[PDB]
């Protein structure tokens, strides 16, 4: 023999809900480093633990649309920052704040061309003078004084552009790839608040303006804090934005106005980890929006893999709620800050290649902390073995991200993702990148559809009968929280008026008639107003 090892080399342990970390270098992912040694076609099971460390130093940057329309949004925001701190203080012992604004490429088509030279300075059409175009300017890096934010945001004046869509994508980029200037710090939760009230220019739009050099993804601001290639370089692509976002562990939040919300929402669906929020007309709302998205960012542990030799493949099994396990998955959602989750990873090479360090990564998205895996290999007519479709030879051994005898099966769960996120709507299981419904009379690509399924009044009861009654199941499986979330409230005497929700009624264990209601508006609300004072038998 010549066994395959998996030796943990560095075992820093989770810092149990301690975010300030007194020179304890704060850990968030337990097994910091391991070193397996595989042999021909052999595998090795291991695992990784990662927790949403309480009191994690936040970082918040304010990218805002400085188009003439966001003039009133500069009023009820000059006071902000100071107003933000009292909210984020309840969430962090340390918090950095920042600002920076965009408009559009200061060139011909977008910018006010050059009719009277009396325009290179303002917006002479009304009589009021504003500012010339600028594209992207960095004012006030990331600092402590939540007052300094107020000092700069007072000094900020709006501008004016010709074109409908702004060029804020250039900003989202510079404000991600320019670490030192902005002041993004290592062990700290990152947040990029992108506020806008109008459309945007995508990549290739710059051909008109005469720009054929594509975005490089590098930092281009100078000592003057203005994006230099704004005029020499075309807009960044959804892919390259998406690339540099994950590498710098930034979280893109889209604080956008109603008219353009559905838009930045599908733009959100192509840049996973993007959070969209309905900004207000006078943008006063920007806070109970920010301090919200934070909750969303810290309620999921997605596992990303940087590098990795093509020769070997990983298999994941995520266990999150009360050690019940979820096979084939490297992501857990519905989490509360402080909790810890474990994934049991596996690895196997299809016939060992040639020696080299070959060290890759496995880490949660947005987290600085990662598990470094150094892999080494202990090595030193036709062929009916087929059936084709990824199937190799000797006797048939599928590739990475493929399974099954013939090799039809997949490892992908994205084809089983749903509207809400839960795999196969919660009514079924993903089988070879394709749901197979545990049919309560349901069907659909992800089992979304179920006409003959019981009304919500029945699904939600499960919640109220616990989150307010300490009984029933959920109490029994300890899942009446992460599973049955929402937000309950003991509505005073009678219930709500807004007829945009269902009113439910039911008899509980104690022979009393409980009365509730399932609402859902604003930003995906979901209150369950419970009429306190159940009708019970008198005596």
């Amino acid at each position: 023999e010549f066994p395959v090892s998996e030796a943990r080399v560095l075992e820093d342990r989770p810092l149990s809900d301690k975010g300030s970390g007194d020179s304890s270098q704060v850990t968030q992912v337990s097994p910091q480093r391991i070193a397996l040694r595989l042999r021909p076609d052999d595998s090795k099971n291991f695992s990784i633990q990662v927790r949403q460390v309480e009191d994690y130093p936040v970082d918040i940057y304010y990218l805002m649309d400085l188009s003439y329309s966001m003039k009133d949004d500069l009023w009820s925001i000059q006071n902000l920052g100071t107003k933000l701190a009292t909210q984020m203080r309840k969430l962090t012992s340390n918090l950095r704040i920042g600002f920076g604004a965009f408009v559009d490429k200061p060139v011909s088509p977008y910018m006010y061309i050059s009719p009277p030279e009396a325009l290179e300075n303002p917006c002479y059409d009304m009589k009021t003078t504003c500012l010339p175009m600028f594209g992207y300017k960095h004012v006030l890096t990331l600092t402590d004084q939540v007052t300094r934010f107020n000092e700069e945001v007072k000094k900020q004046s709006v501008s004016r552009n010709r074109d409908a869509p702004e060029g804020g994508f250039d900003a989202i980029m510079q404000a991600t790839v320019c670490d030192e200037k902005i002041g993004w710090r290592n062990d700290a939760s990152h947040l990029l608040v992108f506020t806008t009230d109008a459309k945007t220019h995508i990549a290739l739009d710059g051909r008109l303006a005469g720009i054929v050099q594509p975005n490089d993804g590098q930092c281009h601001v100078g000592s003057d804090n203005h994006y230099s290639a704004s005029t020499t370089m075309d807009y960044p692509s959804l892919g390259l934005m998406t690339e540099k976002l994950s590498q710098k562990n930034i979280n893109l939040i889209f604080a956008v106005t109603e008219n353009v919300v559905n838009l930045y929402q599908n733009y959100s669906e192509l840049i996973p980890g993007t959070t969209v929020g309905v900004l207000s007309m006078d943008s006063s709302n920007v806070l109970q929006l920010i301090v919200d998205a934070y909750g969303k960012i810290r309620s999921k542990v997605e596992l990303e893999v940087r590098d990795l030799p093509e020769e070997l493949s990983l298999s994941f099994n995520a266990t999150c709620l009360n050690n019940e396990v979820i096979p084939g998955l490297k992501s857990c959602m519905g989490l509360k800050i402080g909790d810890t989750v474990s994934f049991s990873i596996e690895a196997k090479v299809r016939g060992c290649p040639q020696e080299k360090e070959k060290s890759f990564t496995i880490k949660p998205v947005g987290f600085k902390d990662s598990l470094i895996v150094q892999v080494t290999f202990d090595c030193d007519k036709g062929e009916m073995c087929s059936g084709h479709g990824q199937c190799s030879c000797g006797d048939c051994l599928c590739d990475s991200d493929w399974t099954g005898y013939y090799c039809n099966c997949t490892t992908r769960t994205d084809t089983c993702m749903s509207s809400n996120g839960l795999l196969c709507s919660g009514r079924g299981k993903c089988e070879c990148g394709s749901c197979v419904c545990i049919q309560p009379g349901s069907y659909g690509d992800t089992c979304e559809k179920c006409p003959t399924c019981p009304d919500a009044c029945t699904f939600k009861k499960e919640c109220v009968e616990c989150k307010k009654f300490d009984r029933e199941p959920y109490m029994t499986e300890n899942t009446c929280n992460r599973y049955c979330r929402d937000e309950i409230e003991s509505v005073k005497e009678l219930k709500d008026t807004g007829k945009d929700a269902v009113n439910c009624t039911y008899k509980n264990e104690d022979d009393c008639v409980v009365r509730f209601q399932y609402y859902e508006d604003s930003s995906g609300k979901s209150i369950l107003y419970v009429v306190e004072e159940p009708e019970c038998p008198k005596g």
Binding site: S108, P109, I113, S114, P115, P116, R162, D163, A164, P165, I202, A203, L204, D205, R207, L208, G210, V212, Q213, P214, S237, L238, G239, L240, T242, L263, N266, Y267, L270, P272, K381, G382, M384, S386, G387, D399, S400, D401, T411, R412, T413, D414, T415, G433, G441, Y443, P451, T452, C453, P454, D455, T458, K499, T505, Y506, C512, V513, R515, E535, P537
Partner: protein
Amino acid sequence: FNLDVDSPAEYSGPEGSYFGFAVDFFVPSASSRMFLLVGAPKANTTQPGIVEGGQVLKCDWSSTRRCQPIEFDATGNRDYAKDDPLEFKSHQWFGASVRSKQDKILACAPLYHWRTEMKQEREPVGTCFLQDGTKTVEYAPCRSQDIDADGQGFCQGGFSIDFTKADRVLLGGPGSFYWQGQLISDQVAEIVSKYDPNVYSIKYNNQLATRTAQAIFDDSYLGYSVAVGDFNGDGIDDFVSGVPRAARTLGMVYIYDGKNMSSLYNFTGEQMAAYFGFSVAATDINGDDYADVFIGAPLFMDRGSDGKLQEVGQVSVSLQRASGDFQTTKLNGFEVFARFGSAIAPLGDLDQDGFNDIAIAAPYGGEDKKGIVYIFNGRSTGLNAVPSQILEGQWAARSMPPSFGYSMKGATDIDKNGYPDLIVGAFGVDRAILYRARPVITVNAGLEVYPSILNQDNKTCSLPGTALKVSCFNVRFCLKADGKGVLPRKLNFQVELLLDKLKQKGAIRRALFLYSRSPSHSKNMTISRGGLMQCEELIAYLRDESEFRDKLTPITIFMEYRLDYRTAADTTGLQPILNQFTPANISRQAHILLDCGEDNVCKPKLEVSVDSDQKKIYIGDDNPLTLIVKAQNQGEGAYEAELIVSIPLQADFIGVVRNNEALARLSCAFKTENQTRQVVCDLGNPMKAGTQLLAGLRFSVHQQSEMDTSVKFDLQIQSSNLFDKVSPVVSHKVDLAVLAAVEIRGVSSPDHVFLPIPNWEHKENPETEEDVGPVVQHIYELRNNGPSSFSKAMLHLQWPYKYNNNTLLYILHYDIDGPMNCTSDMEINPLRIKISSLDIHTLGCGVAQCLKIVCQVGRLDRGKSAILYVKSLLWTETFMNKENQNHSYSLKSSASFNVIEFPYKNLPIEDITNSTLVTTNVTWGIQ
């Protein structure tokens, strides 16, 4: 599939002139020779005070590689007043767009600014320049009296241009109106015979143009790209333009009438911000004379193996049906970040086989983003989705990416030879390259050995040295080749023969040639004609019995062959290439006589057989089918034995059968060579006598709907012996069957309504639902999950309308989803009730008097359902809370169905029927 990459034509331009940003071919009618047209959008000029007005250069193919500009215009900026210019030519990107015909060449400046004559402005309206030898006229369809952004002030017309065969220009101005865009077709000569140097407007008579659309369509970019072809009916070229920002950054491609300018067709993108429309191109890629649409969205993010989104690009290939519909497929890029449908450039017919080609481009591919170009060939079926060749840039970045393939052009046969050509343009290095298509030869080889069945004890020839007679056998090998182009006369070849190929490095070479005792003989013949197959011959002997042991491992003779240079055309030896799908190897088999007792002939007795196991397959899903064959030899030797299973259009061979200790693992392989699909299996070369085999061939039958009732297979073994070579063709059919698991689920919205009834007033006559009661809602769903689909069925719902003259669950109305029409025997909602405006237990039918809804269904496929949504109203007289047991009632509702008909009549279809119920219990709760 092949064009020269050894020696292509390299062309250059000034550093930063963007030379090679717009490429085209120049074929004058007035000359025997042809040229290159390369745009230099950023090149400086000798026009007074004009910085980078850009230009266009006519390059020489006459192996001089010298390109001197083309005098379109050399004047500076025209005036409107004293020190008040009328237009501004500097940085106009003239050359950014270039097209031509015969002597006629159109070149535009989409960054041409024009100060309107009303106010002091600098609007990028853009102009073109149509030259024709001496006569040069400015063409600016967008320089009208109607100005500013709201009009055509920012039109930048000339962004994309193109001619129709009837000599008419199509133009694209993206910024017209509110950046929605615009198309403008004007016939030349109307452009030529209308130019007046004293008017900056000029109305053209038969001009065609798209109009201002609603505000919602703003910023779509129509005119970003343009291609032209005949789609609508017959006649001329119709207009095709890519609107990369249409929809919600989704993209859209518009097709317009070549004369009305009315919208014919439309195409929409699947993933937004992918720039679906950056490039368009129409070509008949499958010789049925129908322009096919190709569309590029270079920023499309496909799902990579691991499931992650990756920007790699995609090309939408819409094939045009005869009905005007499309059979649109898809084609993704290969590397990430290298753009792909960035430039689709249809070539003529590179290989020249009666099918057009096309070259898609990834400008930023290869190593160090030097970009590559992929050439995809056509076929009767559509486009062969697999690259037939890849052209790689060879230039390093100067200050930005070389951008090789950003702009390419190929379709004209610039050189002598009978095949097209291609021009590619790397402007990040300022270059254009000529890839000359090379001659394609199709060759036919032949190999046949005289005595086929070698006899050891045969006395025929004599060894070279010793005159000892030895067992002879001759071997000849014909070779015929002829190509379609400029190449013939000397197709010389290097042939290589091989005796006993099956014999590895072990060295038991059972056979050798004559005069040169060795199994390897070398030769080099020649030919040229398409039917003059020159044939060479040889003599080979066999070693004596006392030199080797064989056991009959056929002496296979092998044949190889190849081309040579100095068969090419003068102008830089343009070497040809053998057809892509033609093997250079041909090999036959010999067989030492053994066991073929006395007649010397090995005449066998072959027989197949299949047990008919599992007599049925259903219509709808994939039916797994295994065949148990019993092939055997009851005669003598069976040289090169093989099973021949014939299969239909929906059979599809899986594999043999290993998962069985009783079955054999034959060397079976799938094949279609002719208008026939079939499985073959080695039954052992010399399938010895009495040799019995019994294996399993599994398939997976797809349905094909009605299409008769059974499916035949045709079994038979066939060999190489001159006598009794085949077995009786045994045919085997399995019967189709009908299966359709249909079911009926039902449910109640408020399944439980508590009677203490919060807030309710007994009205004299109800007018609203609130005056009546709660909304109890029943829902029944008829669903077919079975394999086979049905064509019609019946649905019957019974409603608990009332009990003893007194109502309970007054239906307001009902809704249907799917294939079904209904009818209630009683009028639903008699009391005209509207929306808001501001015994002991069980009930239902049988006890209460029904109101029935009968519904006619028809058309539920393998995974389709029909739903009936009944919307009631608990009529609150379920009260009577005074005397007895008004305490609890259960309102029962029950629907049933009967599948009466199916699409197959051939198969024995039986009726499917079942029922279900739905309760709404109204109890007293508190009491």
